[PDB]
């Protein structure tokens, strides 16, 4: 699924081995000077080994403190040591960089000027949020309104709005699906999916990412062999995969898992996180750039925090699905609310994508964040990098490789005032680390050109142009 | 300067200590770690090809046994210690006994051992240690010895 | 070699391609979800223009007995300045985990801010007040550890409970006799194995009972059997000390006996989030190898923009803690001499419960017989009232009620208002 | 002594 | 930079040497120089 050139497997398994036997060696030289109130250690001495000996090393690629709105520039607080690089301290200078590892696609965390007037005025007449749940006084006027919107814009029958878009996963899956039921999942999910998958008392399998030729082959041994040991059948089966799987890029094969998922019937769990405001030429995400029936899927999750710049998720259905969530969905009876400027933000959003503020500039975005993406992956390709994803995502990772690469690719793009995220071992499989590159639609053409000229000239000293350019 | 690509598949294996035994690249370093700290080892101190092997496969073991067969669980707190009472040799492929991967590590002791042997010229105070070292490896890694201790000594 | 081998049947022939097609023609699923009924399908009030004392439902004036603020800070003149400076500074949104970009400066201020008003070295955020216990419990307990909580603690807590895979044993509802007896019956069971970690997980105000769990007890038993205290003091956090510092002013105890205390900022600040505190060992491990924290948007800043404000102005104003005690005794002077109903809280928590005595049947069946009650209380009378919604995920076993959050800014109108009302309908509909 | 290990060491591995 | 002080960096991040401390990196540098050294003045006689 991705091709590796031979000789870089080769340098990466030699560093990351010489990073693990100087480890060792020095951690053998601790154990024996802690000689100079009785409880239990917090932790073990060997449970977070990568953790002081690979990432301490590497700490200031990580929680970079900014001083400004999320927007296509920002200021990045500058911090020291002071004591030989333990506790990093901030000072009061800062820098302006070019940002390219925030979320805003739609450009919508800044200061607009339909949303921000709107949400200020919903503030100063109902107070931050409600100390209340919402089946108990949490229920105000502007969330019976913003769950209208929302069905209006998904286009299923009926839909809840949660606060967290971490509990939109924990804290359902469990009604759904209990105690001999099966889950197939995706081997890429979120950690919010096998968390709530292991919240309940299902068993779970994993069928290769993004190919159903063997998504089938799973289905029919799972059927054929029933539970694990006493061969009962299956109470459910649920097969949970994404839109745009992120830190892969790839957009999902709908059309031919749904058509598996008919003939088995099995359920299915769509995952509209990161492809909900980016994708489709009106921006209902991929049931619609697919060509789709919306109802061939039984469950679709999403979440406001990418696209439309504010915290929040949603579950949309059939009108008996959400009845019953309302009455048995602990998230839904015992946390707090939304906050109300945090609802309204989204309900002046939805306005201004489906074009009803008046302005047209609900498709000057959704046209600016595809012909931005479409440049910035083509001009990359050209130039012999290695970047993953389709023709339409707004995310697409480059390959690094190797773990040397994290602290220099990132250390010189933030000196020459760009700023990018880079992922390491412990998160991601060994020989896979890389950088994740956002692309919204408040960029110019003049930034990326000056950003591409960055690039290029930071990826001639550490060499990660693995493909021949032209 | 870069040539040789090669499509990778995921194995699943959905556990991060041993899934990175599976891509591409893994024998191949394996050896060369071998070959390398044999030249290192008769450069900073001029000796026999004999011994150098030696000291070689008595480092080896060190090692590997202390890795393969000494800890247990993971140093990966995602998974909330569910391999508590498994070292890293009986988790490797969900269990499954006598596969490709597997082989291979069990038959690199002995063809070490052979060549730290036939240089040596056999004697006594080399082939004694050599031989415990390579038994104590081959014993350890046989299908039988699965999941069970010796007088409970760190096996609970 | 023969003569010690095991007798083995000989191996069967695999399915053919064939037979598979019928076993997956006739596997049958159940329905997703259980068909709806007609008592399964009640909508709340929605309401208007705010949700503090006095709050508005249909254009009539209602007063509030729901809402969580114990010191009527919804709507504060202070509070209004501070978000609306913030959030046309800002925007209205986190764009980012904490690890990568999520990390404003309000972020540290405020954790800078909350560390100093309770003494102690370092503090956490989390981005959302329920998932404060989903994380912070399965970041301490592994699979092999042994955990004594407390049978009577909410979904939150006993949600993380169940995800850190630990060994869990329950005792009493505020037993100490239980407790030391569940103590001794573990340090005897587990006696070889030294290296083990144990916990004590407790919470300072109960939400499903209103009762104060007692802090000397519990401090003095876990430094005699080397244990470790995780508080959940999200009810008394502000309200409970008579500086507002929460159970340990309350009895007057040291906060570094106390390892972990975390807490819920939509009670008694008047936003949303969570926070963990304790020694810079504990809180800057969990940083990196938590759940919630790495994996989820931070905060919103013009909610932690709010959270500084608060706190200010609960630290500048320690009178409105007096004016809440007053209050709670109020409605208790107002509401002992009920006919059905019980008060079965503790005297000083501000969470008025009430019992209902001579259970009317089922628990299936009490709950309906609660939810009407609570239903006409506003109706007629205009006023709001909470009654208890188990859900069938939930595993706690107390007894149903009605609770009342009294709050620092009800009227000595309103607050007997809510007990007349009240004798009457338990009067006319229980006996 | 030196044949016989050699020998039946190339057994053991097929 | 120029063609030496590039390939020389190149180097470092090849094979993890740019994460090491100074003295990490000075006990393996001169390591791997005696390793160079040695095959060079043998082999290019012993044969
Ligand atoms: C200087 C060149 C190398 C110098 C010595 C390097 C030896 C280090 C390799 C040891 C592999 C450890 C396998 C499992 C260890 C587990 O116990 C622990 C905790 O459970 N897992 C972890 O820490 C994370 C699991 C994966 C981390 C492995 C990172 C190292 C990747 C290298 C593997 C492929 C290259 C070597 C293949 C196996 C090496 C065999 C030892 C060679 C002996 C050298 C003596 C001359």
Redesign the pocket.
């Known amino acids: 699924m991705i091709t590796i050139p031979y000789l870089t497997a080769v340098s990466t398994?030699?560093s990351?081995?010489?990073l693990?036997?100087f480890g060792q060696l020095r951690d053998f030289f601790r154990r024996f000077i802690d000689w100079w109130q009785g409880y239990a250690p917090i932790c073990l001495g060997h449970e977070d080994?990568y953790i002081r000996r690979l990432y301490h090393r590497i700490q200031d690629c990580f929680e970079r403190p900014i001083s400004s709105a999320p927007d296509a520039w920002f200021d990045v607080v500058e911090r020291y040591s002071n004591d030989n690089n333990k506790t990093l301290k901030r000072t009061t200078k800062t820098s302006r960089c070019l940002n390219l590892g925030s979320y805003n696609y739609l450009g919508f965390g800044s200061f607009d000027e339909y949303c921000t007037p709107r949400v200020i005025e919903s503030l100063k007449k109902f107070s931050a949020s409600t100390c209340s749940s919402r089946v108990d006084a949490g229920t105000t006027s502007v969330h019976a309104e913003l769950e209208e919107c929302v069905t209006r814009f998904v286009g299923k029958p009926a839909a809840v709005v949660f606060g967290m878009g971490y509990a939109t996963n924990s804290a359902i899956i469990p009604v759904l699906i209990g105690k001999g039921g099966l889950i197939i999942s995706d081997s890429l999910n979120h950690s919010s999916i096998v968390n709530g998958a292991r919240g309940s008392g299902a068993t779970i399998r994993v069928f290769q990412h993004n190919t159903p030729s063997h998504l089938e082959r799973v289905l029919r041994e799972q059927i054929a062999e029933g539970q694990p040991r006493t061969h009962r059948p299956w109470k459910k089966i649920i097969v949970v995969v994404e839109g745009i799987y992120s830190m892969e890029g790839e957009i999902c094969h709908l059309p031919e898992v749904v058509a598996i998922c008919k003939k088995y019937k099995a359920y299915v769990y769509l995952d509209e996180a990161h492809s909900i405001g980016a994708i489709g030429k009106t921006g209902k995400g991929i049931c619609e750039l697919l060509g789709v029936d919306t109802a061939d899927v039984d469950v679709m999750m999403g979440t406001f925090t990418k696209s439309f710049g504010s915290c929040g998720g949603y579950i949309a259905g059939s009108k008996e699905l959400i009845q019953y969530l309302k009455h048995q969905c602990p998230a839904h009876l015992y946390a707090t609310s939304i906050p109300t400027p945090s609802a309204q933000q989204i309900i002046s959003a939805i306005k201004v994508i489906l074009g009803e503020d008046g302005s047209n500039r609900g498709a000057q975005k959704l046209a600016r964040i595809r012909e931005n993406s479409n440049f910035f992956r083509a001009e990359l390709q050209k130039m012999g990098f290695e970047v993953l994803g389709d023709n339409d995502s707004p995310v697409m990772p480059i390959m690094l490789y190797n773990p040397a690469k994290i602290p220099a690719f990132s250390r010189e793009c933030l000196r020459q005032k760009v700023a990018v995220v880079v992922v390491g071992f412990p998160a991601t499989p060994?020989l896979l680390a890389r950088a994740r590159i956002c692309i919204s639609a408040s960029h110019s053409r003049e930034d990326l050109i000056r950003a591409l000229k960055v690039i290029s000239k930071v990826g001639d000293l550490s060499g990660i142009k693995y493909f021949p350019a032209e | 300067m870069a040539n040789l690509y090669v499509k990778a598949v995921p194995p699943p294996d959905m556990n991060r200590?041993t899934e990175?035994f599976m891509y591409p690249g893994?024998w191949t370093?394996?050896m060369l770690?071998?070959f390398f700290?044999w030249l290192v080892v008769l450069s900073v101190s001029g000796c026999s090809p004999g011994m150098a092997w030696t000291v070689?496969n008595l480092?080896?073991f060190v090692?590997?046994y202390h890795?393969?067969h000494w800890?247990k669980?993971?140093?990966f707190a995602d998974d909330q210690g569910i391999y508590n009472g498994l070292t890293?040799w009986e988790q490797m492929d969900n269990g499954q006994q006598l596969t490709r991967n597997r082989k291979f590590l069990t038959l690199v002791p002995v063809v070490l051992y052979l060549i730290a042997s036939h240089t040596t010229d056999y004697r006594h105070p080399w082939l004694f240690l050599n031989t415990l070292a390579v038994m104590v490896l081959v014993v350890a890694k046989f299908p039988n010895m699965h999941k069970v201790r010796i007088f409970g000594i760190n096996g609970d | 070699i023969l003569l010690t081998r095991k007798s083995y049947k000989p191996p069967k022939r695999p399915l053919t391609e064939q037979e598979i097609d019928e076993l997956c023609d006739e596997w049958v699923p159940e329905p997703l979800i259980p068909p709806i009924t007609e008592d399964m399908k009640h909508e709340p009030p929605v309401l208007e223009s705010a949700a503090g004392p006095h709050t508005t439902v249909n254009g009539k004036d209602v007063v509030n007995f729901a809402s969580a603020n114990y010191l009527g800070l919804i709507g504060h003149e202070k509070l209004l300045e501070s978000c609306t400076s913030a959030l046309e500074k800002y925007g209205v949104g986190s764009c980012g985990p904490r690890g990568f970009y999520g990390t404003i400066d309000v972020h540290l201020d405020c954790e800078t801010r909350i560390s100093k008003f309770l003494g102690t070295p370092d503090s956490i955020l989390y981005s959302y007040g329920l998932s404060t216990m989903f994380s912070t419990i399965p970041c301490f307990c592994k699979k092999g550890d042994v955990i004594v909580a407390d049978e009577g603690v909410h979904w939150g807590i006993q949600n993380g409970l169940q995800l850190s895979r630990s060994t869990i044993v329950y005792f009493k509802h505020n037993d100490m006799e239980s407790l030391r007896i569940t103590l001794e019956k573990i340090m005897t069971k587990y006696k070889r194995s030294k290296n083990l970690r144990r916990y004590i997980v407790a919470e300072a105000v109960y939400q499903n009972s209103g009762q104060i769990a007692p802090l000397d007890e519990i401090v003095k038993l876990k430094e005699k059997y080397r244990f470790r205290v995780i508080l959940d003091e999200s009810n008394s956090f502000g309200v409970l000390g008579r500086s507002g510092r929460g159970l340990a002013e309350h009895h007057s105890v040291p906060i570094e006996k106390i390892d972990v205390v975390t807490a819920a900022m939509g009670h008694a600040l008047a936003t949303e989030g969570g926070f963990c505190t304790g020694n810079a060992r504990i809180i800057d491990y969990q940083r990196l190898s938590s759940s919630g924290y790495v994996f989820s948007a931070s905060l919103p800043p013009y909610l932690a923009s709010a959270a500084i404000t608060a706190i200010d102005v609960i630290d500048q104003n320690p009178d409105m803690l007096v004016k809440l005690k007053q209050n709670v005794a109020l409605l208790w002077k107002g509401l002992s001499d009920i006919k059905g109903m019980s008060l079965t809280s503790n005297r000083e928590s501000p969470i008025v419960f009430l019992k209902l005595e001579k259970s009317s049947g089922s628990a299936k069946d009490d709950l309906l017989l609660l939810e009407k009650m609570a239903d006409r209380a506003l109706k007629e009378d205009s006023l709001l009232v909470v009654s208890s919604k188990r859900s069938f995920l939930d595993k706690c076993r107390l007894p149903v009620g009605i609770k009342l959050y009294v709050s620092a800014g009800h009227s000595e109108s309103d607050l007997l208002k809510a007990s007349e009302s009240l004798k009457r309908l338990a009067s006319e509909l229980l006996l | 002594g030196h044949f016989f290990v050699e020998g039946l060491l190339g057994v053991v591995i097929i | 930079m120029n063609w030496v002080q590039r390939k020389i960096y190149l180097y470092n991040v090849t094979f993890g040497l740019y994460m090491l401390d100074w003295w990490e990196r000075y006990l393996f540098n001169s390591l791997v120089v005696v390793l160079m050294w040695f095959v060079l003045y043998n082999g290019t006689r012993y044969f």
């Open positions: 398994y030699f990351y081995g010489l693990f036997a080994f060994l | 200590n990175w893994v370093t394996y770690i071998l700290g070689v480092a080896h090692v590997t890795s393969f800890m669980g993971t140093p890293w």
